[PDB]
């Protein structure tokens, strides 16, 4: 198991960065794909997820609004675009995946894959 | 949910055990429990997952335990790799919350 994602970025405040997830090694369908924040000298927050087969998401109240998810299975690939950015939005975002719902050892409560964060500057 | 780990500083010798602890402002369930290792300049790896189990490819040096509101990871032994920080994470409410994290 594998995710890729996008090099660093760096935006100016009220600017939209999207960040790129490319993942291999699994069925990319059968998972969750996660997204978790961290600031500089932060701990780790989570942004929401994404479900590729349905296209279906849920946000943390923190973003939501703010933050969108989406895929596309054709190149196993997830994105996280996070619309009119804030100096404190300066962070490393990671990408994670986690068992969905339905998984019956609650695979879905923790994250098993992580990529390389991709750090976003505003 | 307030997920608070402690010590925020752990400092020990290498080969010695260290015991990390994590503490909810309310009962989690075993199963929601989880804790990860992160390593300088490196994205968080999972170590335990249900409380207690081990992720694939983590050393038995690694295990965790307890239920409610008091849950801890403990290192048998410290190697020079195990210098990180290390996470707890809950999910619950359809969230996932992690702690401030403490350093090894």
């Known amino acids: 198991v594998q995710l890729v994602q996008s090099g660093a970025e760096v935006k100016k405040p009220g600017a939209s960065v999207k960040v790129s997830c490319k993942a291999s090694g699994y069925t990319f369908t059968g998972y969750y794909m996660h997204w978790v924040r961290q600031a500089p000298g932060q701990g780790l927050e989570w942004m929401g997820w994404i479900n590729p087969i349905s296209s279906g998401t849920s946000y943390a109240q923190t973003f939501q609004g703010r933050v969108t998810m989406t895929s596309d299975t054709s190149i196993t690939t997830a994105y996280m675009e996070l619309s009119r950015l804030r100096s404190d939005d300066t962070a490393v975002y990671y990408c994670?995946?986690?068992?969905?719902?339905?998984?019956?050892?609650?695979?879905?409560?923790?994250?098993?894959?992580w990529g390389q964060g991709t750090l976003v500057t505003v | 949910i307030v997920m608070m780990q402690s010590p925020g500083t752990l400092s020990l010798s290498p080969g010695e055990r260290a015991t990390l602890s994590c503490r909810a402002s309310?009962?989690?369930?075993?199963?929601?429990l989880a804790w990860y290792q992160q390593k300088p300049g490196q994205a968080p790896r999972l170590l335990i997952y249900?409380?207690?189990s081990r992720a694939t490819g983590i050393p038995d040096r690694f295990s965790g335990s307890g239920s409610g509101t008091d849950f801890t990871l403990t290192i048998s032994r410290l190697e020079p790799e195990d210098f990180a920080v290390y996470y707890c994470?809950?999910?619950?409410?359809?969230?996932?919350?992690f702690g401030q994290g403490t350093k090894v």
């Open positions: 994670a995946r986690a068992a969905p719902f339905y998984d019956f050892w609650s695979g879905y409560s923790y994250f098993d894959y």
């Open positions: 994470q809950q999910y619950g409410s359809s969230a996932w919350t």
């Open positions: 309310q009962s989690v369930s075993s199963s929601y």
């Open positions: 249900g409380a207690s």
